[PDB]
Design an enzyme around this catalytic site. Structure first.
Site, short mmCIF file in Angstrom:
data_model
loop_
_atom_site.label_atom_id
_atom_site.label_comp_id
_atom_site.label_asym_id
_atom_site.label_seq_id
_atom_site.Cartn_x
_atom_site.Cartn_y
_atom_site.Cartn_z
N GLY A 4 0.79 -1.13 0.01
CA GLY A 4 -0.16 0.01 -0.12
C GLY A 4 0.75 1.32 -0.09
CG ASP A 39 -0.40 -1.55 8.56
OD1 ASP A 39 0.41 -2.17 8.94
OD2 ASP A 39 -0.78 -1.47 7.43
CG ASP A 83 0.92 -5.43 11.55
OD1 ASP A 83 1.67 -5.88 12.40
OD2 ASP A 83 0.03 -5.92 11.04
NE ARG A 94 -11.04 16.63 20.66
CZ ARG A 94 -11.58 16.23 21.90
NH1 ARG A 94 -12.34 16.78 22.40
NH2 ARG A 94 -11.03 14.92 22.41
CB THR A 137 3.16 0.12 5.88
OG1 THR A 137 1.75 -0.10 5.65
CG2 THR A 137 3.64 -0.33 7.18
N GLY A 185 -5.89 -0.17 9.83
CA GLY A 185 -5.19 -0.92 10.69
C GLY A 185 -5.76 -2.47 10.63
N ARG A 186 -5.67 -3.18 9.76
CA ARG A 186 -6.61 -4.61 9.54
C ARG A 186 -6.16 -5.29 10.67
N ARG A 190 0.61 -5.20 -6.42
CA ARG A 190 0.62 -6.49 -5.94
C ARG A 190 1.10 -7.49 -6.76
CB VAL A 226 -8.44 10.13 3.55
CG1 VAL A 226 -9.71 10.41 2.69
CG2 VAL A 226 -8.76 10.16 5.00
N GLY A 235 5.55 -2.74 2.78
CA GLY A 235 4.95 -3.38 3.88
C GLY A 235 5.35 -4.60 4.32
N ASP A 236 4.70 -5.66 5.00
CA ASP A 236 5.21 -6.82 5.40
C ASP A 236 5.47 -7.73 4.33
#
Lengths: 319, 319, 319, 319
Positions: free
Chosen positions: D11, D127, D129, D154, D125, D170-171, D72, D250, D102-103
């Protein structure tokens, strides 16, 4: 303790409000009253003190500035001030004080505990030059305020105006200049903790023009000199038209970043923990990404340093 | 017209890319080819000209600056310059030109049509001082850049540092200073189009301090003078600590606001429409919230003014 | 008039505070006292009324929300509630009322005025859905809130996830969707004021893909349908991976843009002038870039429209 | 090494560009050439390779997204694609690869070293992670995107509409939810790493309302469940009006924060250092505020955790 107090001292810094919130809520969560002290140490001396309810820190976590206001008071750097201060604290039944601010605030906190009143320091300033912490609350926001300026400058640059100087804050500390300069892609960064030669600066400038570099951005910490001054020297020596931005107190202002509110929330609560568990005379901080605290006097004895490897890297990447 | 060209001239303005996008897309919509002229009138003389495809303007609408670059070309203000440009256009089969830029860029458009090349000017500058338009593309964005700094200054203010001077752009036009000042809640706004008195200005500060005003903000158009000088004079006369911010070229950079993207999209398209209609020697604009176009010479002969009612309003509200 | 009041009603709009500030300052500048009515009409009825001093509106010009609060008061839709309200006003020596908010908020002003109580309406909402003004205070800010989201989505676009749906507010009006979609370069904009054909939408999307368009963005006014639904129809019809963002109340929040603060300031001030000039039952606004005011009931009779040419324009540019 | 390559995979993450620029400049600074691999591992196989000149990574440090594009590639998950790619690399004379992503992109870097081809992983990434690093490039930026939304909510909150659910990304990691939650003053945070009780949740909300809390903000990580459902379940059970914002992609967009540009600059450079030292098969990161590297296999072995004390703190401060 049954009742603590809290105040802000020194220049404004983004995240002070988030720190005040944390101090207030942490204490209330443990059944302790929190009294607000307005207008820094001067307000303490003057007994400008008023209880803070759980709701009085609602909707400030995201606000810049400080709802308690601040001041510069050198009178608290005297026995007389120390004495009047403690009278006001006792008269309002305040057993411990959380001080959120810069260098001058820690000296006051040190004195306070030398006078037997439990006090904890929380590092709230933008220029990141408080001992016992890798980062001060506000520094991250300030960096982002600076790179907003740099980024706009990159858009505005043209063929005949491709040379820009930006004067940032940091009278003795170069952290703002170094981090924002590295983050902004600055070609040259002038800090106090390292030396510069104008011939090198000018050469870097010309080297970059030759190789086709679209623009050159120069960050100058106020502690090194005036942006307007370097701009003049640079144009004079190269004949490149040089424009200058002087940010000023804009750096002290604005809504705190995610990192600043998190840090402020973590450090404020720690300060409360330390008061409640009988510690005093300490300052809180973050080091190696871990929550820490130190004897204030010990911490104030540590010189502030920058990351020289980071400084060198910023020179390597602007080639 | 089978084919047209588009270029940017003068200082960079937020939204020039939106206007470029619009010119390219509108023309391609009607089956017309569009060629980019890079580095403005200098690039035109140099024949720095490449075809712009429908996808060459993807992902630029939200970007500051101009993917075509600008330049200053005095050479184009000479018959021999207007000649090599006409030649380079004909060499490229370019029958009409959209010029996006400041008041200066309009001169080239005028001449070009007199020599039988239809040309339309699109007002691209932050100064907001182009005739035949209430607003220039970039002006709204510049305004938001200024109040960003003013807002941060509001957070940074303290009891001891409560007086601030911010110098903004606009060479002879106080539009930036007046609008940003009003929206920023400035106490004093210095613009060339209005007489001011430093004694009244200082009176205002003292009055605000007396009534408990937390801070006072002074906006200064560069056309009136240096922020540094005004600040020094204010601190010298009052003893009030006075800080100075000089934004400089920051005001010309950044992603365009919604208003500027919309205005750029509409003016840009109107320009293509005018050429295809067989019009020429016109500049586009927005007046009374309505799209308009004027002969270039007639437009550039009216003196620019600011809204005096808005000026007085700013003094009223800032008590 | 020795004493007037001000309240906010309807949803929150960015710039309400700027308008509150202007009402208070402009009145105080003419030596009229201003009283705040908290929690809208419900508050008026409950006598939730308190004096605003000159400094009570300090540091709000840049703040989102409303320091007076809002409150949907159906009780004020009844001739009974109007009586208790006018009672509380008289009880508090309040001679005239400025009302800042959306529709429904104006109906209240009318009826108060039908009852001989002088009231002026100020257009405060993000929907742009109020008669007698081209723009409502908050609309511009909302637009910029939307394009911030659209912009970020441009960066997050890949080959796989090239298709995005964003649902924006508007209630019954397409203004937000139209202006933001144009400002953000949306391929497709679905609004109430204009017919759409989902098939043409599908084909427009396929066409974009065929010609290398890196991503397609579709803006959906909430008053047309659900972003999640449309997003389904599209993934199903095209087998393109479609992601949906729903912004929701985020569009009513945040710090007002420069244009919103300027509009808020001018209209709030004008409202006060109308009260002192002995008018009442008027609503203020900006039409053709000029300050205007109208009879409420009369303006309320106009049906709201969008610029259909802008809508057309939007289709032409996103090929 | 006399020549290396760089690519982005997974991503999009703010700061991928800063990292790319870093890899490129650090290499070129030591006399090494850098080649761009476009469209991730698919492009490496397809052989989409072009040299990156020093000016080619100019003006990208502040841009979101990735100029190399991402992808991908399941084909590379095979020993066929891995040899195909090793082939494409050697065909261009590339002795080492830097993979920013990413991972999954690390799994790819593992195999390439297995097959004798030196590769280093750089954590890109949002997240957070990714093992071997406290923070991933993009995380800080994402947090700020999220609190921008929370902040505006607010402002938009009223007495009637005072309960809000924001679903964030955050999957499987709740870092975004946790950190943005604490920074934004969320009352309740729902993350995979911590069991939660809709009852204690409802009870929290009810206590908040009783004590006069102005509004309640609930943050929901996508891994835990859907924001829309949670808002429906909550409204049903409370009759409290509940609004839902779903940010979606976003969070992956926008210009990187200062910390992300700094981190990307530092981690990218170290990746080059490692390759040039001859130390392929590793990933770089920041741990305990120091630069680290680990064997990839050893790193991927560690489970991802969060700081349970920060989760607890967040509960304490939102009473």
């Amino acid at each position: 303790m049954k009742r603590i107090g809290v105040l802000t001292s020194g220049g404004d810094s983004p995240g002070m409000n988030a720190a005040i919130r944390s101090v207030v809520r942490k204490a209330i969560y443990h059944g302790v009253e929190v009294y607000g002290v307005y207008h820094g140490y001067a307000g303490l001396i003057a007994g400008n003190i008023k209880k803070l309810e759980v709701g009085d820190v609602g909707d400030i976590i995201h606000r810049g500035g400080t709802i308690l206001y601040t001041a510069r008071c050198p009178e608290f750097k005297t026995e007389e001030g120390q004495k009047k201060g403690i009278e006001q604290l006792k008269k309002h039944g305040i057993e411990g004080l959380v001080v959120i601010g810069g260098d001058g605030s820690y000296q006051g906190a040190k004195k306070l505990t030398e006078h037997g009143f439990p006090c904890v320091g929380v590092p709230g300033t933008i220029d990141n030059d408080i001992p016992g912490t890798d980062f001060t609350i506000g520094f991250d926001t300030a960096l982002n305020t600076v790179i907003d300026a740099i980024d706009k400058i990159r858009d505005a640059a043209t063929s005949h105006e491709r040379t820009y100087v930006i004067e940032v804050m940091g009278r003795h500390a170069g952290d703002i200049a170094l981090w924002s300069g590295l983050a902004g892609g600055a070609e040259t960064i002038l800090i106090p903790e390292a030396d510069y030669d104008m011939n090198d600066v000018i050469a870097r400038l010309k080297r970059g023009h030759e190789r086709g570099k679209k623009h050159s951005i120069i960050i100058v910490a106020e502690g090194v000199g005036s942006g307007v001054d370097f701009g003049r020297q640079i144009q004079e020596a190269t004949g490149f038209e040089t424009r200058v931005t002087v940010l000023g107190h804009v750096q002290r202002g604005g809504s705190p970043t995610a990192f600043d509110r998190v840090l402020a929330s973590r450090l404020g609560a720690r300060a409360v923990e330390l008061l409640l568990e009988g510690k005093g005379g300490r300052c809180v901080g973050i080091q190696n990404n871990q929550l820490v605290d130190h004897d204030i006097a010990e911490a104030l004895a540590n010189k502030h340093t920058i990351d020289q490897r980071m400084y060198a890297l910023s020179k390597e990447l602007s080639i």
